[PDB]
Design a protein around this ligand. Sequence first.
Ligand SMILES: COc1ccc2nccc(-n3cc(CCNCc4ccc5c(c4)NC(=O)CS5)nn3)c2n1
Lengths: 187, 186, 487, 487
Amino acid sequence: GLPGKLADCRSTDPRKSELYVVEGDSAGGSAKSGRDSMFQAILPLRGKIINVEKARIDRVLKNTEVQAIITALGTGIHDEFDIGKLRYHKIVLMADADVDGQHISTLLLTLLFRFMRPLIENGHVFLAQPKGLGEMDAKELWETTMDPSVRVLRQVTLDDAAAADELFSILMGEDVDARRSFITRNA
Amino acid sequence: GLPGKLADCRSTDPRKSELYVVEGDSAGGSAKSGRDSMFQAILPLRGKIINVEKARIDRVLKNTEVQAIITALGTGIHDEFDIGKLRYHKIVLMADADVDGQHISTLLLTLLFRFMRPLIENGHVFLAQPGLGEMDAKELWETTMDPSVRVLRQVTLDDAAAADELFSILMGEDVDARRSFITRNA
Amino acid sequence: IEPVDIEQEMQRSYIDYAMSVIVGRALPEVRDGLKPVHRRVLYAMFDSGFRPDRSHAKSARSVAETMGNYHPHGDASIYDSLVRMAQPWSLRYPLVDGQGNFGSPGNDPPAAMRYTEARLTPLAMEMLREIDEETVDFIPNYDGRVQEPTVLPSRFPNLLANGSGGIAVGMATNIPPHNLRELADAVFWALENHDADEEETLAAVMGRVKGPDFPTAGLIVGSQGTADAYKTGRGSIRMRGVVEVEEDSRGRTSLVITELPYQVNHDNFITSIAEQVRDGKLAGISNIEDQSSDRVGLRIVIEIKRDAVAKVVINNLYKHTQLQTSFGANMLAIVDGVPRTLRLDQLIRYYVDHQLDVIVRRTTYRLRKANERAHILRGLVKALDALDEVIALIRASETVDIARAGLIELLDIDEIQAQAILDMQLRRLAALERQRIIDDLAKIEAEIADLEDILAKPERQRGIVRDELAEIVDRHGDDRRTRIIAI
Amino acid sequence: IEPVDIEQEMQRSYIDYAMSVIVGRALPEVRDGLKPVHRRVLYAMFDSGFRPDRSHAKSARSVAETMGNYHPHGDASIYDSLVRMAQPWSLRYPLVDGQGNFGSPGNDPPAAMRYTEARLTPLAMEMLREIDEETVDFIPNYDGRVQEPTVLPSRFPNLLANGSGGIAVGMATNIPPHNLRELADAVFWALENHDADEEETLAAVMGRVKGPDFPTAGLIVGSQGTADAYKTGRGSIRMRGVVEVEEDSRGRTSLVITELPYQVNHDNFITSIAEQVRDGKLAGISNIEDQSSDRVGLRIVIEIKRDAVAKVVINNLYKHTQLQTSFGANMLAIVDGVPRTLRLDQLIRYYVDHQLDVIVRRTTYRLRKANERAHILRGLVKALDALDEVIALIRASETVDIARAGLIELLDIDEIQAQAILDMQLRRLAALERQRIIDDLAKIEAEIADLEDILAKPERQRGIVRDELAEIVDRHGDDRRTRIIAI
DNA sequence: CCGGAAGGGGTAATACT
DNA sequence: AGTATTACCCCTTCCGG
Ligand SMILES: COc1ccc2nccc(-n3cc(CCNCc4ccc5c(c4)NC(=O)CS5)nn3)c2n1
């Protein structure tokens, strides 16, 4: 029971595996062409993913992309989360350099925080720094981000959980005013 | 009990109804905007319809577009065909003037001939003279969708047997026969 | 490896996306009234010559230019924006002249990019009037290969004539369309009364414009919503369709809806009334039909039951259905790059200021060009009065550079006009050509004097703005559609 | 209303569609070696300026020019053809230089039109060399607005160098790629032995080319299929991938397939092997892995159980999997708009006549241009010796037309040369520029003599064709990839 | 499964009434 | 829920061998 579009690695143990999450088949092809297939897995998405913070649990558990993400990860959600099942000990979100890539990264981070908080607090989530990733061919894409020896990744970390969920709520919740004030003062 | 893509008319009696079959939803919208909605129905398609003469019956009836054509026509296929239903007493196959339009028209004609022979025999099939998405409502209505000014080609049978031979050589699986035919008739 | 805090990256990325979506995605520009996608599409179509003089061009080509040079986004967004700009029911004054299947007011989608062909309209030519004369600022695009304008010259008030509704992050804007003649009257008042304070100009422009004018026509009932919108920016214009009763031979009466309020989705209204009849909320209605066509326009027939009155069915339609709804107008727009809620007087003043700046920049560019032309013509005529000596020197000179030095020494000439003298054609030596040269120098000097006078006096440029906008309105003016009535 | 016979309409419509698909959809042209879509894409990239001198351009833009101007078909088809032209594993000599994700030999799809940007290649410039010099014919496009070439100049044998397999109605063609050096040798023999008969030409060209050369390399076992293809056009070239045996530290062995036959889909061969192992047809293989990467190329490693022989497993793979396949060569191509099967000598001869007529047309056009330039320069020189008379006459002329008539009278000049001396710059008055005028007149006369000489002697034309082909092949030559071996 | 062709649907964020 | 900008994608046919 694995997602159909996932391209897995040849590594057996999870300790030396990587799951690169991309937001399209056009970027996924470039990523998988120029990857270390023995260690690195490519999971393509459909672009904008559902908002976990602005929807009910049934719908966010009905949407296809989040199902694919949790099946590729293999773990549980909320209380039934189990770290020992984790298929990849490194989930790298590799989005495009435009603002829409940042929006998709925010949506995915919100989903992970509200559903796989452990994954985040154990320091198992990374962000990659590559107008899109479908314009990059195999060689330089491998050279910058897919080469483990030279690549640089930003590891998501938690300083205070309380401020974390407070910011997540006022930024992804339904309270528009809150975020109006926030963006007005902090832009 | 009717296809979702079908844009039906408001008339009830089939005697004054007619179904315009188009090969695209862009052409479908262009035709529906410029039609007489009280009498004219629009049925869009998805491009090239399956080849009836080059496939098995189960695979043919599995295809969605031919099923939509059959249900919109309302009638059965083969022996159970009954002209009583004929939701529309005028089935106008309406395709573009390019070569792909002629191919789609031939495919639909062979499908109707194999599955709805009394439909073609009764003179209930017509051919239009218009890509179609480049026409808005105005000229579409003025040229071929206005009943009082439009002209249409009504399909008719003179000799059934020769028609069967021609259909078999053109749409069958005998490649060299159609090779000889196209070389002779070019 | 370097860690990043979850909250810091979260806020950052979301604030960057939000600021981008606010400034350059959906909110309109107060000076031009256009979103960046519309601006880029219009400029590409103009630069590509798709203009009313020329024939139409395939929309796929223009979308590809917008994508390759200007707009680094999906083709579907650019195409749907173009189709919306080419929609009579969505725009009071359409900016694009389209051909093909550009949609329907109901649920029909526009044809594909390969089926529809779009050119510009005369309104779009006033949109892009004298853009190449350094009127507006230009910036490099994303890859820096080509230049695109930050704003269009906008010789007519697009933001208020066509309105702009857009959803952004944290805020949404909804400006209703207006009539061009009322806008012209308001801007004329603002130009003549350029020293008026905010309250006086607000009262004057509220007197000048009656209210929003929608392409769908219909009716507006009441005035409190319109007044609140024009005085604060946040209002609720309660709009309603048009109904009429028709008598049949058997005595049956039917309501004939011929107009619907703004942004009401056709063929969804019909399903809604059918559903309300089925489940039962709109008792009194027996049959519903759409006689709407291409030749007769929107015409919905509702045949009601015998035990029913027209007034009660009409009131039930108003209260329960979309035959009557509200336009929640919010006048949010981008000024100096930031979002602000603006009343009508602020919009008129900002448009007038933009027009004055554009006229001043155009006059400065024309003056510079005339100065260069006059300088070249002066050097050329100074060479002309010594034609025999100049010809002798050009003959005796070994090469071109020695001739340049000789001419410079002979006629106190600077290298630019000497270079022009070398390029001077032989056919220019005919007496008529020399006389034309003298008279052209005189005319260019007169134009320089006139341009200097215009630059000196602001009343002159205000007069030019008034005259050009009056010319635009008279040639592209139309009568008001929606009739404002009382409660 | 008019009654239409079913059989007549069916036959007419299907004949029209079939003829269109044969002549102008899938069957390559013998002279150009390209299908109409490829020709149109190439000319669109050339006319729009997407050439190796400058940087790349978005593929969406090029598809848009092709669709709007030349190719009235879906953008998906045009983009797929462009990507195939930019694919190394699909074309022996790629014609388009692409950037982005143009796919993989396996099941990976190419990136979208808005992500890949493509320009031409130097070989594509040899394809479109001197097209503007009336070398090739031109026709109006589908809507009759612009002109497009029927055939590209094709300065090298693209049809045989890259091959063109395509499915049409009633017929399907398949031509394998070759090596540029071997084709050069064959065409050189054809040019030198221009009077040879069909049999001797066929024997010589068969001697010149060992066999088809595929971009995927590999092996060709036997020679009967290749020989029968070259003498009849219908053959069967059995390709076989490269298989090697390696040992492991534990004593295990694993077969490494580093090369596969032509048109064999990767990532489907591997799943085919896996399914055959699962059901059980190739007993002996224990595990399958794809060590393939961007840095090592294709590498399929299948490790074998202890109680098996590498040779028997290799033969099992050859017999049951896609490791060994056959090319059903069918040398079918379009000659003067007719589908015909051709042996190799016919292809060489057709390319030779194409090159000859292209050279003749180019030289005729150059001769006409040089004669016009010589006429202008002769007029300018003959007006130049009467310089003071001409200047004095132009001065006394009230109008330019009077000066023109006076020059006609004074020098016995025609209209066009009189215009030429009228528009003559003052820089030409200098002594050095007059000397340069006379010098270039002499050089242009010498060029006219040389071009008339080229028109006179067909041996000269054959020589020019040979030298251009040799220069092209030296510029863009490569070693042979596939090794032809015995059974 | 191969090379050109026909045709097209469907999720998601974003506020506000 | 629908309004307008955006992210993003798959899946049937025909046509020979
Ligand atoms: C129907 O279900 C699905 C499922 C998945 C899908 N995945 C991708 C695309 C899908 N569809 C796209 C289209 C419309 C075709 N586009 C017309 C066009 C014309 C010119 C150009 C152009 C595009 N693009 C440029 O960049 C410049 S030129 N219909 N479906 C699709 N559809």
